[PDB]
Point group: C6
Chain length 91, copies 6
């Protein structure tokens, strides 16, 4: 297992991916400074398109509590419907 191979599934809840991310990151042989830098880069890059789009609107300076509260709706009826509703207006 490698922290770089950790990617968020398309139907995986955000709370679990960050769980495996932090579950595996606590094992990667590196310094705490590197592990914090990993968090700043990987976590937002290896997320799925739906979650990444939500995070790009948050701007910088957000915390997990700010991310996860914004992503635990992804995969929910309001999200899936809103996404499916915006597409019909796009087409």
């Amino acid at each position: 297992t490698s922290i770089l191979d950790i990617r968020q599934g398309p139907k995986e809840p955000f709370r679990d991916y960050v769980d495996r991310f932090y579950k595996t990151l606590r094992a990667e042989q590196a310094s705490q400074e590197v592990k914090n830098w990993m968090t700043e880069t990987l976590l937002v890059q290896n997320a799925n398109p739906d979650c990444k789009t939500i995070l790009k609107a948050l701007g910088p300076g957000a915390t997990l509590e700010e991310m996860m509260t914004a992503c635990q709706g992804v995969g929910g009826p309001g999200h899936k419907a809103r996404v499916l509703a915006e597409a019909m207006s796009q087409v």
Copy 2:
């Protein structure tokens, strides 16, 4: 294992989450006064948008059994359609 890490999944029924909440809350080393304050605060805060939207409409003073009965529709055919139908009107 921390009570603050307990978050409702987007496809998780409200019942399970409250069970994990109280199953996890039963382990947190704290005073009973603080644990009651947790329930009033986190339980509805760490929920997903669909339930929090329903719970925000109940207002305050609502009882557990009073809420759990209002969220067991989320994820059902009647709900998903009502969500999907109101969304088409939103756009």
Copy 3:
């Protein structure tokens, strides 16, 4: 475990909830006469809206066998579509 904590999930089939209900009702330490009263009251109240909507339409004089035959369509293609179509007409 308590008879009052047994509630049907939003995506759970009826045939199972009644199984959990009667599996727990046979465990509650109480008299047989009161347990029948539980059946008449809890079973239809602690169900989800979709099944409750169909059971309320049967009226009084049901026999459980008449209910379960009326709810095994909930969650199926015919139902989910029928529900989604009636909502499309509203908005």
Copy 4:
């Protein structure tokens, strides 16, 4: 369990339901003549609306191997879509 409690779930394949039906019928204490009559009556009566709609259209005289082939389409994209389309025109 009792053969009369065997009911097809809304999301259960017909092949599985008929599997449990015969799995239980081989245990119910009854005569071969009694068990044959059960097959003719319950199997099509305890089925879900989607399958019963297909089997009611076949009429009588239909054979097992002739029914299974008519119900293993239920739950497929063509079915759910065809059903999901006819309802939109019905409402």
Copy 5:
């Protein structure tokens, strides 16, 4: 078990059914000519409507790898949509 009872589920991938088909065929007491004739006959008949629809367009002569590649799309986002779109146009 029996090779004649092997039927493709409505929500089952093809590669699994062909897996179970050959899993059972390797046990059926028969001649190699019988098993080959089984393969040419049952495999396409006991498939579900969606897959049988695609195979009927391939005609005869097609090879396994030639078929399997045409059926691993059934149940995917592109398939379910194409099926749902042709049905909306049919009515």
Copy 6:
């Protein structure tokens, strides 16, 4: 057999590549053959939706370039975009 590994219609790409490489590490072959297997089967035995995305990426792309393009398949945005293009296509 490495040839029998195919991506299901509802299987994530990251899982199929796992099973793909899980078998390839056992197949008795030369390193050159296993690399050629990777270059050929991996993109061919995937499902239409993922293959549709990979056919658009062209050649010269690495796994990290693919996996990052297929983890949207099966997500709400994907099924919706696909379902929206189909309504206009038909």
